[PDB]
RNA sequence: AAGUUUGAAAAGCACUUUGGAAAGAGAGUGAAAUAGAACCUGAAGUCGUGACAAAGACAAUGGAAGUACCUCCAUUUCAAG
RNA sequence: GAUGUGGCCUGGAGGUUAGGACGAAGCUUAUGGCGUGAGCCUAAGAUGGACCGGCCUCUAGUGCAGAUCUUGGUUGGCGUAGCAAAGAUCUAACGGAGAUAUACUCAACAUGCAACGUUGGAUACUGGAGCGGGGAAGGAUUUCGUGCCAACGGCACUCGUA
RNA sequence: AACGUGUCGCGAUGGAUGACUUGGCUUCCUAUUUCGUUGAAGAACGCAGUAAAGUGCGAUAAGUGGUAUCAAUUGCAGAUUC
């Protein structure tokens with residue numbers, strides 16, 4: 001249930017020349033500022049995740 | 054000016070190394086740790102950061118006595 | 134042993150030294166088989182073997198080492214040369230050889246006695 | 252393994268150099284001009300370029316370089332004098348000459364027949380720009396291969 | 405060759421700036437051989453450094 | 455971020471020759487070196503080189519119908535047919 | 536916008552029927568053939584080195600050109616814009632692979648340039664609120680000697696806080 | 698002419714695809730199964746003939762003692778029931 005969502009990611013908003021997808025916080029690594037949480041982002045959460053019910 | 058120039062005005066340090074937990078989080082002026090709350094007897098723990106809890110909990114270190122006592126329990130305190 | 138390929142391969146490749154010893158066994162010859170009623174024995178230093186598969190088949194020699202970290206045995210007559218000219222021994226997997234003469238000790242005799250099929 | 256093969260292997264000499272730290276665009280022009288030349292003629296040309304009495308014509312990578320009279324002999328108006336590439340190509344020619352001598356051929360009869368320059372893998376540095384920006388500063392090295400053959404009078 | 409070490413040691417021994425230390429340009433081989441304050445003092449006594 | 459996935463086995467390139475060195479040219483191991491050490495396969499995009507086709511400015515690409523030259527492609531025919 | 540299709544394609548399961556070291560998957564194409572089409576099949580590889588095709592049912596994380604889409608890699612502009620505050624170096628000898636480096640012909644110029652460390656000499660600058668000599672905060676071996684010059688010192692190095 | 702354009706053969710740069718898998722995720726079960734003032738969990742500093750990290754260990758320190766095994770360890774050295 002937690003896979004692909006273990007980040008404190010927030011959208012940067014409009015007014016910067018980037019797409020409005022949520023982005024990883026922080027700095028000092030190659031993952032900082034990368035896209036997050038979406039089913040189209042590398043390292044994101046899949047669409048309609050599967051369940052045991 | 055509030056940017057580059059002011060970066061050169063930062064002189065001392067707010068935090069030093071903590072005796073109990075080893076992080077650079079011991080507030081010098083209020084003699085207490087921001088990471089583990091030393092010298093309060095119990096430690097800091099909050100459910101709004103399960104990630105921090107899992108970074109600090111049992112089994113992330115050595116367990117140098119717990120391994121021994123676990124084996125004794127599994128063997129029923131066998132003795133000659 | 135395991136209805137799980139993942140677990141079986143993990144156990145094989147992480148086996149300790151005393152388990153690798155048993156896993157590195159070789160069949161006995163027909164004469165030794167008939168003398169002892171035992172099919173196979175773990176290989177040991179100073180036994181005599183003959184190579185049965187590969188490039189060196191038909192060669193004979195004496196076991197100089199059971200490396201056991203590389204999963205091979207070294208035979209003194211099985212070797213080749215480097216570019217320099219000096220010779221090096223070539224490792225062989227123990228299931229590709231046959232034992233023709235055992236190195237006997239009291240405990241090895243006891244092992245054969247407990248594995249006897251009579 | 253070169254991208255072309257000499258007609259007669261026994262009368263040919265080869266030479267090659269990889270990841271050479273000279274500019275790919277300068278070395279391309281410097282090497283391409285000697286392609287059909289006899290070996291002694293090529294070496295004379297390189298010496299005269301070092302002396303600045305003749306030039307290297309820049310035919311492909313020449314956007315907004317200067318104009319010179321010494322380019323007229325090549326049918327152009329643009330040319331330069333790149334010493335760093337010239338000395339490396341002189342070294343390569345010396346190696347090919349040594350290989351020919353060891354095979355037992357006469358260097359005063361060799362004719363260069365194959366020349367090829369390629370972009371190699373790049374190296375990365377950085378430069379600092381206004382408003383706290385960082386931007387790439389890269390190096391562009393090259394591979395060079397050539398072979399020469401004995402002409403038959 | 406480099407006589408930086410000898411020049412530094414001679415500055416220290418003679419108590420002057422480097423601009424006042426003079427190393428003989430014809431005895432470079434001899435000055436090359438001095439590696440200690442004792443040897444440099446011997447050079448000063450012999451007159452290859454003034 | 456990052457599979458250390460060379461090869462069955464290091465047998466991981468002795469030796470000669472050019473070079474300050476890195477390397478190159480030979481020689482050798484291996485079934486294979488276009489398997490030579492971050493080494494299975496090795497795509498697209500982009501670039502070099504050799505050969506060839508032409509070609510004004512008509513942006514290029516595109517449709518239809520022919521022709522000149524080419525074609526490591528297919529199929530059918532060779533005598534009573 | 537609705538619906539149909541013994542309509543096409545992808546990963547896995549139950550059946551059935553086959554292939555492969557005399558070369559499976561993957562990849563390449565002025566390789567043709569079939570189909571209105573989605574696509575299918577053969578040929579060649581001077582490619583690869585161990586798995587896999589058809590048919591009937593079952594099942595799904597099942598088809599991309601564009602979302603200022605995500606991540607990796609390329610690319611024209613381009614040898615372009617530029618590398619212009621803090622005045623500045625010159626000369627000989629020594630050192631170094633870093634030269635005085637040549638095919639005929641040719642005494643030398645017109646065919647090996649550019650650049651470096653050390654010592655001596657010359658010329659200038661800092662100008663005691665100093666590119667002088669010591670300390671606190673901050674840093675933690677950057678200090679010393681001998682080597683070395685792959686990367687780094689946005690030019691260079693035989694030199695370096697590398 | 699040159700620069701440019703197009704096609705085919707051969708090379709470079711680049712690291713996709715296929716095959717591989719001692720990893721992950723999910724479900725189910727069995728127990729004389731639940732730490733600490735007799736000093737825990739965590740944190741620090743050390744220990745090898747050669748040893749940066751990691752692993753193991755504590756000045757008895759890549760281990761002492763006992764039982765069972767039965768001839769290694771291995772990059773290089775060093776040295777049968779011991």
Ligand SMILES: [K+]
Pocket residue numbers: 617
């Ligand atoms: K410029």
Ligand SMILES: [Mg+2]
Pocket residue numbers: 003004043044
């Ligand atoms: Mg995921």
Ligand SMILES: [Mg+2]
Pocket residue numbers: 062
């Ligand atoms: Mg203040």
Ligand SMILES: [Mg+2]
Pocket residue numbers: 082
């Ligand atoms: Mg304060």
Ligand SMILES: [Mg+2]
Pocket residue numbers: none
């Ligand atoms: Mg301009």
Ligand SMILES: [Mg+2]
Pocket residue numbers: 378379380381
């Ligand atoms: Mg800048």
Ligand SMILES: [Mg+2]
Pocket residue numbers: 057383
């Ligand atoms: Mg800034």
Ligand SMILES: [Mg+2]
Pocket residue numbers: 496
């Ligand atoms: Mg490969």
Ligand SMILES: [Mg+2]
Pocket residue numbers: 596
């Ligand atoms: Mg989907």
Ligand SMILES: [Mg+2]
Pocket residue numbers: none
């Ligand atoms: Mg796509």
Ligand SMILES: [Mg+2]
Pocket residue numbers: 619
């Ligand atoms: Mg300028």
Ligand SMILES: [Mg+2]
Pocket residue numbers: none
């Ligand atoms: Mg200035």
Ligand SMILES: [Mg+2]
Pocket residue numbers: 662
């Ligand atoms: Mg003044």
Ligand SMILES: [Mg+2]
Pocket residue numbers: none
């Ligand atoms: Mg530089």
Ligand SMILES: [Mg+2]
Pocket residue numbers: none
């Ligand atoms: Mg893959």
Ligand SMILES: [Mg+2]
Pocket residue numbers: none
């Ligand atoms: Mg409890």
